[PDB]
Swiss-Prot record:
Entry's family note: Belongs to the cationic peptide 04 (cupiennin) family. 01 subfamily.
Keywords of this entry: Amidation, Antibiotic, Antimicrobial, Cytolysis, Hemolysis, Neurotoxin, Secreted, Toxin
Chain segments annotated as coiled-coil in the UniProt record: none
Main localization category: secreted
Name of the protein: Cupiennin-1a
Keyword Secreted: yes
Length: 35
């Protein structure tokens, strides 16, 4: 019913992630290097 979020979330969901492109770039190696 609410098909307006497919054009409204593109301004939100695709706004914070653009800056956090490294939030998951190093997670399985950051803790592995410590070991």
């Amino acid at each position: 019913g609410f098909g307006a979020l497919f054009k409204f979330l593109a301004k939100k969901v695709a706004k914070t992630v653009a800056k956090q492109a490294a939030k998951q770039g190093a997670k399985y190696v950051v803790n592995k290097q410590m070991e």
